[PDB]
Symmetry: D2
Subunit: 198 residues, 4 copies
Amino acid sequence: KHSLPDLPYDYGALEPHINAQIMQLHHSKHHAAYVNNLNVTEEKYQEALAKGDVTAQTALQPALKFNGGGHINHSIFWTNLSPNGGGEPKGELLEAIKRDFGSFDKFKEKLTAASVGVQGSGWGWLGFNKERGHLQIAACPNQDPLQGTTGLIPLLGIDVWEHAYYLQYKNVRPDYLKAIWNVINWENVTERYMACKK
Amino acid sequence: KHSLPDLPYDYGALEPHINAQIMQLHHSKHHAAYVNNLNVTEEKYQEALAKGDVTAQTALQPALKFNGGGHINHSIFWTNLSPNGGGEPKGELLEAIKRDFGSFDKFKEKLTAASVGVQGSGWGWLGFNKERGHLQIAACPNQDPLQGTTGLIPLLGIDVWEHAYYLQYKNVRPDYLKAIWNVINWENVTERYMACKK
Amino acid sequence: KHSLPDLPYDYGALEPHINAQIMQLHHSKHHAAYVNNLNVTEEKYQEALAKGDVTAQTALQPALKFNGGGHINHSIFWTNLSPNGGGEPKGELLEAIKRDFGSFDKFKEKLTAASVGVQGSGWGWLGFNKERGHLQIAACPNQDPLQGTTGLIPLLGIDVWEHAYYLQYKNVRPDYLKAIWNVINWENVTERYMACKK
Amino acid sequence: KHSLPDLPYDYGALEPHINAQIMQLHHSKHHAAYVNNLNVTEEKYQEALAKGDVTAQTALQPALKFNGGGHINHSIFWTNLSPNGGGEPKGELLEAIKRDFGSFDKFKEKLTAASVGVQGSGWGWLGFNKERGHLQIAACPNQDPLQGTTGLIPLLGIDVWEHAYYLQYKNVRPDYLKAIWNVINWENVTERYMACKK
Ligand SMILES: [Mn+3]
Ligand SMILES: [Mn+3]
Ligand SMILES: [Mn+3]
Ligand SMILES: [Mn+3]
């Protein structure tokens, strides 16, 4: 089974960067619909699977990738945001970032470009290519999970669905992006990075 | 070459159904951005085409379909809404709805279903299948336009990107649907229908 | 579990239309790889599913749609071909076909156009739209199952992957199509049609 | 405007590796069809563009990417093969293969993996990621060309459509791969590499 995880701050710990109304509707509304559906779908799956009904397995795929990723994506997200965040990573993460993107500002520009360029709903991500042994930026449509659809370990995800920023920044997705840099939990991404060189 | 059309009613003319703040951002900001980027992409496409540079013709395609579609879809969208709309059609459009849907309500239910089911940004459509002589419900992803991607002649469209109802209905896409039913310009859907049956 | 079904004719019952070498390599080579993989994948699925590992469920989707459809598509195919086939359907099927496509020749042209137009690997199909209550033609990429990915009941499938005709007709896919009309099992498709109005 | 290039060796010059019958059909028939349909699509694209007819620009895209890509991919393909090829590269190309793959063989194994794994018609690529300064393996579906769809500069390509090995290797895509390794024109891959590092 799956459960909506608790936010490790409250709906306002992120003001003024991401306002309270968004952090509430986002977590308790969207993310919550994902997990119910994930569960409902996984169960409908178990059945189609037992009867070896391939038509069913196939028909349930989209709902399971959308809701599955909906759940994983947002769960990683919540951990990536922290009221005492922002700044620059420190330690190895920064060095890898220096190594892979040239500097932290270039890294910043690139991930902003990637998130700003997804047409429609999607996510911008910094991931770890365990195969090549280096950081990579990817962008995914709708709720497509990063690792699943790509094999990259998600380290940092930026939700660019309009519901992630509409009530506050409106159509101005680059502003929402300027903001999010102040509430990024570098401690956690360093963590997520650390477990990749494990 | 492409120009943002003008709305045939003022921004608040569809209240309480779609609040004027949505109407003002959607037309002036969103639809505006498409037209503009559309004009810029075609410009780039012509250079790429003039040199038979298949690489750049290929790279510019997403942008072209996205923005061109964005422009087409919304232009039809404003024409499908009217302050003096709502109700049901009559004459042939209705004869046809029954033929193919059984009843206006069943129709009414399928189009809502198709629109509510869009995963992420997209659109629900009532289209006309010319080859078939039939009316047809179809959903499209992002700004992929109906006719160009499906061959169906567009009759009525319902934008389901979050930007089209989030400031009002929040996550409740379903409430947005129940409401838009009241501002449907049946004078226009019927006009669109009368043209294929020529 | 899944098993490669027996062909209900032998690798030559279809000469000269589809030669023996093709009917053998196709059935015992391709179709056989599908079912092994289907099984292997379905099992790997059951596991990812129990541990609620969404990354895994997601990563195994493509192999399960490809191999699942690989198996269903080809199984339907074998039944659609018969040494004492060809001709025109008779009974209701023909009337529905007369109703939906205007005549049998138009139907023939359309399904030939659809199969001839799939870019890369794919299938051309005549299916039943149980919702609308009429015959519809669709085309699917690679091994995408018809019913699963579309909801249409498969009545008649024409495999247009190059392995379906290369050793015999070479790049000449329309010739392979002219041929297949002589070995079509109208008895079976009428059957498949019959169970749809059930 | 587009012309089928000429092969830089005779059709049987790559035996016993790729039989001359494959070479003659692939260049004269397959590649020929792309170029031709490419010239016809661009022609149609220019009319559609000249009228800002977004609908037709949208409808012609598959055809354009397909045929344009088909032309691009194959043209590079003939240059990547030579009767006096085989072996391993040397100089910087090899330095780089090691840097990024560890060893020529590991490289050799990943590209085969990527090529053998293509579901349906497609291509395996060894490309150059300029932004990164790295060599990169990438697979593409149908005729989607590397650079136009991925941004990677194409270095070596291995066609995995069935038409490229079926008359010889039949279903055994893997045997086709083991064989093509012997006709790789490393003089050309190196030339392609030397251009990005400019
Ligand atoms: Mn979200
Ligand atoms: Mn809109
Ligand atoms: Mn087959
Ligand atoms: Mn080829």
